[PDB]
Amino acid sequence: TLPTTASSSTAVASSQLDQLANFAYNVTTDSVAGCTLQNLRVRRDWRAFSKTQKKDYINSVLCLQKLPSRTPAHLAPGARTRYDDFVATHINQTQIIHYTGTFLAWHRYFIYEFEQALRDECSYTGDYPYWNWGADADNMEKSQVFDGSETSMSGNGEYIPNQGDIKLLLGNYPAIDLPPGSGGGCVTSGPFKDYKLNLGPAALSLPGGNMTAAANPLTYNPRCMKRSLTTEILQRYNTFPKIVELILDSDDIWDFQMTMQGVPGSGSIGVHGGGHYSMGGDPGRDVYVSPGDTAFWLHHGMIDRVWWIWQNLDLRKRQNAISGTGTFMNNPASPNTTLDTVIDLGYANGGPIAMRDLMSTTAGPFCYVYL
Amino acid sequence: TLPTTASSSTAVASSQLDQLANFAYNVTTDSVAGCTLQNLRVRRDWRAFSKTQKKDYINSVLCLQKLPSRTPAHLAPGARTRYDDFVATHINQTQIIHYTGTFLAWHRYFIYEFEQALRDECSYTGDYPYWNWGADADNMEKSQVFDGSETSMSGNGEYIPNQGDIKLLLGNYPAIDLPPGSGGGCVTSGPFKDYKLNLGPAALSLPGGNMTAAANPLTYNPRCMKRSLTTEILQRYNTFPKIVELILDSDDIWDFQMTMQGVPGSGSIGVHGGGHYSMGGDPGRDVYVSPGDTAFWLHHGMIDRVWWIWQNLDLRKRQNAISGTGTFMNNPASPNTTLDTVIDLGYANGGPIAMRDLMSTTAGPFCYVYL
Numbered sequence: 212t213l214p215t216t217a218s219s220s221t222a223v224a225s226s227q228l229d230q231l232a233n234f235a236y237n238v239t240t241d242s243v244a245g246c247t248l249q250n251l252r253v254r255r256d257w258r259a260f261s262k263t264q265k266k267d268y269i270n271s272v273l274c275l276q277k278l279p280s281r282t283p284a285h286l287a288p289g290a291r292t293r294y295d296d297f298v299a300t301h302i303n304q305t306q307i308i309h310y311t312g313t314f315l316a317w318h319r320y321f322i323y324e325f326e327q328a329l330r331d332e333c334s335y336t337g338d339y340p341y342w343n344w345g346a347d348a349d350n351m352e353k354s355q356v357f358d359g360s361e362t363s364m365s366g367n368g369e370y371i372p373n374q375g376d377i378k379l380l381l382g383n384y385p386a387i388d389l390p391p392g393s394g395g396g397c398v399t400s401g402p403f404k405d406y407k408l409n410l411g412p413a414a415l416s417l418p419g420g421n422m423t424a425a426a427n428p429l430t431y432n433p434r435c436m437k438r439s440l441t442t443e444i445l446q447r448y449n450t451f452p453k454i455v456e457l458i459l460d461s462d463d464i465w466d467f468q469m470t471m472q473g474v475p476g477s478g479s480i481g482v483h484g485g486g487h488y489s490m491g492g493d494p495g496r497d498v499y500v501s502p503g504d505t506a507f508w509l510h511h512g513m514i515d516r517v518w519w520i521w522q523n524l525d526l527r528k529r530q531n532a533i534s535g536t537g538t539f540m541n542n543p544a545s546p547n548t549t550l551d552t553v554i555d556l557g558y559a560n561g562g563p564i565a566m567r568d569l570m571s572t573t574a575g576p577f578c579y580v581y582l
Numbered sequence: 583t584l585p586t587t588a589s590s591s592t593a594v595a596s597s598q599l600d601q602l603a604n605f606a607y608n609v610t611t612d613s614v615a616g617c618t619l620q621n622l623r624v625r626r627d628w629r630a631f632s633k634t635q636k637k638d639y640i641n642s643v644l645c646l647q648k649l650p651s652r653t654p655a656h657l658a659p660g661a662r663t664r665y666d667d668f669v670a671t672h673i674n675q676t677q678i679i680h681y682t683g684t685f686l687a688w689h690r691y692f693i694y695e696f697e698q699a700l701r702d703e704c705s706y707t708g709d710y711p712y713w714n715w716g717a718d719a720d721n722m723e724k725s726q727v728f729d730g731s732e733t734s735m736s737g738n739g740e741y742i743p744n745q746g747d748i749k750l751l752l753g754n755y756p757a758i759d760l761p762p763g764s765g766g767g768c769v770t771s772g773p774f775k776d777y778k779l780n781l782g783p784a785a786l787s788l789p790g791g792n793m794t795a796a797a798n799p800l801t802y803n804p805r806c807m808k809r810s811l812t813t814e815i816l817q818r819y820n821t822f823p824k825i826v827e828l829i830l831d832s833d834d835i836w837d838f839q840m841t842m843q844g845v846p847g848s849g850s851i852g853v854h855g856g857g858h859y860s861m862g863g864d865p866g867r868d869v870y871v872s873p874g875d876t877a878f879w880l881h882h883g884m885i886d887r888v889w890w891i892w893q894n895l896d897l898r899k900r901q902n903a904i905s906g907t908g909t910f911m912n913n914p915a916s917p918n919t920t921l922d923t924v925i926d927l928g929y930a931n932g933g934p935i936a937m938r939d940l941m942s943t944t945a946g947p948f949c950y951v952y953l
């Protein structure tokens with residue numbers, strides 16, 4: 212039988228999450244028969260990756276960052292690489308994604324098309340990786356995603372001392388205070404030290420309250436990728452209890468995405484916000500440019516997995532569930548998101564597609580499960 | 583001797599507003615003694631206009647609706663007239679000009695350049711008019727702005743029986759219910775009976791609670807202007823007690839501009855929202871395309887007048903006061919508006935300009951007062 216409420220103990224919460232993930236894996240594989248059991252791809256924990264499997268993905272990411280970009284030069288003069296095209300369209304559509312009826316499905320399609328670019332343009336045969344936050348909640352610097360070795364998405368940045376508190380002011384709600392992390396500067400080690408971030412910043416938070424915004428975040432400004440891994444941020448919004456609480460106590464699609472992103476006026480940035488700002492640095496603290504951090508795709512693999520688990524717990528009522536509109540926090544008011552709403556990814560990959568073709572990981576263009 | 587508490591009687595609260603406006607006129611004119619007393623412009627109540635002066639203003643707006651548009655066709659394929667240029671830049675910029683730090687200053691510059699277009703291209707030499715809502719709150723159908731005569735902005739629309747209410751979402755709160763007015767269809771008389779809106783709808787609130795939104799509201803979509811005059815909406819938010827209350831009880835620019843536009847979670851839409859939705863119809867109920875209604879300019883002459891009165895009650899503290907950010911209700915977050923923030927009107931008229939040059943009606947490009 213399945214867990215009913217989330218546990219206040221960290222080990223038990225991991226067991227419930229596992230048992231909920233096993234229930235989700237079971238429901239999906241037993242239904243499937245263009246998608247079969249034989250081409251059903253599997254996404255796995257980045258720790259389940261071998262140190263040779265890690266290098267294949269990293270090498271496939273490094274290759275996409277070296278191919279020429281597809282976006283027209285006038286629409287984004289700062290885009291140079293195939294990697295920049297995905298970042299460019301995320302900057303372009305930040306106002307109509309996030310806190311929208313399309314938030315969860317747009318990012319499921321976003322990461323899927325990012326995988327296709329790896330498989331078709333940089334010859335990737337491995338599995339898509341995801342980052343389990345709760346496993347690294349007590350020591351993010353030891354996390355195999357951020358440990359600074361050459362099997363990581365690079366590690367911490369240079370420790371800038373005497374850094375001010377990060378203050379987050381979205382909307383007109385009172386600020387949320389966060390520690391500045393143990394880094395702050397350019398990344399040290401890892402296979403991405405010479406990775407040149409090209410676009411942004413658009414709305415980058417800074418230690419001390421400021422927000423660096425460029426005149427046009429689509430213009431060319433090459434720079435390094437900065438990081439300041441903040442373990443304290445993870446153990447506040449990303450422990451195993453928080454992850455299982457997000458799944459077991461969200462009973463409608465509204466409560467799920469709201470709790471996931473951070474309920475307004477609640478002092479919580481949710482699992483989505485806490486996963487972004489824990490990396491710190493640039494573009495870690497920029498909601499527009501965050502795909503510029505290579506740990507974005509492992510982060511959203513886990514976001515999709517948490518949505519995938521919650522969906523299967525009641526496929527009758529949760530597969531096609533949608534709530535929200537087409538504008539950030541319905542500001543200003545916009546029509547309700549429906550199954551007929553068409554979204555696109557700009558010039559990154561793919562074409563415009565309706566929402567109903569996105570709700571299932573074993574339908575539409577999708578054919579995959581999680582382990 | 584100035585009042586400090588707004589009154590409940592419409593008669594004596596009307597007297598209060600005349601005192602404050604007169605004090606404001608006294609402070610501004612004595613301060614002028616490139617802007618002199620000899621060239622100082624005056625903006626007057628639409629009721630102060632004689633018959634010939636009313637037709638003078640209308641015919642210049644009518645001429646603006648026939649001259650060819652300046653906007654390049656690929657940026658706004660639906661723009662056909664100079665009047666469309668102003669509506670198009672408003673649609674384009676709606677999400678960074680409402681509930682921002684620039685809201686009041688952007689619209690002061692917006693109507694000034696619209697006035698400059700009347701003067702330099704349609705030979706207008708008269709005064710800029712405004713609409714005193716408090717005088718028509720007892721019957722909008724009697725208003726000199728809306729009676730549908732030769733000297734109106736056209737009047738009511740064709741009758742549509744048994745219509746549902748208007749549901750307005752203002753923040754993360756339940757919808758505010760407004761009566762649907764006494765019209766609904768295309769306008770029946772007045773000098774704009776045959777006037778064509780060519781843009782939108784971008785987000786048109788409909789009776790019953792629905793909303794229409796074009797896929798791209800900047801494409802060609804010619805149609806009549808619809809109206810549904812609603813006296814009760816003016817009664818709720820635009821009586822003389824409501825106007826004097828906004829001026830006297832607002833202690834800083836944040837309180838003032840929020841109370842003017844409508845505070846979320848209070849059931850009010852402010853005098854600004856009350857003036858827009860009391861017209862009803864299309865584009866009166868569209869936040870983006872609202873300049874498409876010809877009463878928009880007289881409506882925002884009075885919005886500017888109320889800010890001017892509020893400014894002059896404590897010039898040393900209120901002349902250059904700013905609060906807010908560059909995004910609609912700070913969603914998504916953005917840097918604070920400063921005196922150095924720059925705005926433009928696209929291809930409507932003029933060039934870019936900073937906030938410091940916009941805070942006074944007697945500095946920058948401005949030299950005007952209100953009667």
Ligand SMILES: *[C@@H]1O[C@H](CO)[C@@H](O[C@@H]2O[C@H](CO)[C@@H](O[C@@H]3O[C@H](CO)[C@@H](O)[C@H](O)[C@@H]3O)[C@H](O)[C@H]2NC(C)=O)[C@H](O)[C@H]1NC(C)=O
Nearest residue numbers: 284285286288427653657658670671674675800927928929
């Ligand atoms: C609505 O507002 C946006 C601004 O947010 C306007 O977009 C701007 O349009 C101009 C010309 O169409 C773009 O100019 C471009 O400059 C680059 C510089 O490298 C050049 O390479 C291009 O060939 C082009 O000349 C400008 O970048 C663009 N801005 C943004 C942020 O996209 C838009 O025109 C406005 N629409 C209307 C109808 O006013």
Ligand SMILES: *[C@@H]1O[C@H](CO)[C@@H](O[C@@H]2O[C@H](CO)[C@@H](O)[C@H](O)[C@H]2NC(C)=O)[C@H](O)[C@H]1NC(C)=O
Nearest residue numbers: 282286287299300303304429556557558797798
């Ligand atoms: C950002 O998004 C806008 C629309 O959301 C894109 O603008 C479209 O561009 C195409 C190609 O030039 C035009 O055919 C459309 O008419 C445009 N639509 C609008 C509403 O302007 C823009 O190209 C996107 N930019 C990037 C870099 O993805």
Ligand SMILES: *[C@@H]1O[C@H](CO)[C@@H](O)[C@H](O)[C@H]1NC(C)=O
Nearest residue numbers: 212229230231232233234237
């Ligand atoms: C998943 O299915 C297998 C076999 O069908 C079963 O043994 C296992 O217990 C299931 N998972 C859970 C959590 O019960």
Ligand SMILES: *[C@@H]1O[C@H](CO)[C@@H](O)[C@H](O)[C@H]1NC(C)=O
Nearest residue numbers: 417418419420421422918920
């Ligand atoms: C930016 O931050 C610095 C502190 O490093 C502060 O002194 C400055 O006032 C901030 N800029 C603005 C415009 O507030």
Ligand SMILES: *[C@@H]1O[C@H](CO)[C@@H](O)[C@H](O)[C@H]1NC(C)=O
Nearest residue numbers: 583601602604605606607608
């Ligand atoms: C404005 O100045 C005139 C000048 O004589 C004066 O009569 C009037 O009382 C003044 N009004 C206010 C409100 O100060």
Ligand SMILES: *[C@@H]1O[C@H](CO)[C@@H](O)[C@H](O)[C@H]1NC(C)=O
Nearest residue numbers: 465534535547790791792793
């Ligand atoms: C829009 O969707 C919400 C659900 O978030 C629903 O409550 C509301 O009634 C919908 N509005 C209309 C006009 O259908």
Ligand SMILES: *[C@@H]1O[C@H](CO)[C@@H](O)[C@H](O)[C@H]1NC(C)=O
Nearest residue numbers: 378380420421422916917918
């Ligand atoms: C905006 O200004 C306020 C002034 O009260 C300041 O406290 C805050 O840090 C500023 N925020 C940003 C993002 O600049």
Ligand SMILES: *[C@H]1O[C@H](CO)[C@@H](O)[C@H](O)[C@@H]1O
Nearest residue numbers: 220221222348349446450
């Ligand atoms: C298990 O560990 C988490 C951090 O991973 C704590 O937040 C919790 O209180 C429990 O001790």
Ligand SMILES: *[C@H]1O[C@H](CO)[C@@H](O)[C@H](O)[C@@H]1O
Nearest residue numbers: 591592593596720821822
């Ligand atoms: C203000 O409005 C009231 C109606 O609410 C009138 O009774 C009064 O004479 C003044 O016109």
Ligand SMILES: [Cu+2]
Nearest residue numbers: 301308309318
């Ligand atoms: Cu995103």
Ligand SMILES: [Cu+2]
Nearest residue numbers: 483487501511
């Ligand atoms: Cu994210």
Ligand SMILES: [Cu+2]
Nearest residue numbers: 672679680689
């Ligand atoms: Cu406006």
Ligand SMILES: [Cu+2]
Nearest residue numbers: 854858872882
């Ligand atoms: Cu307005």
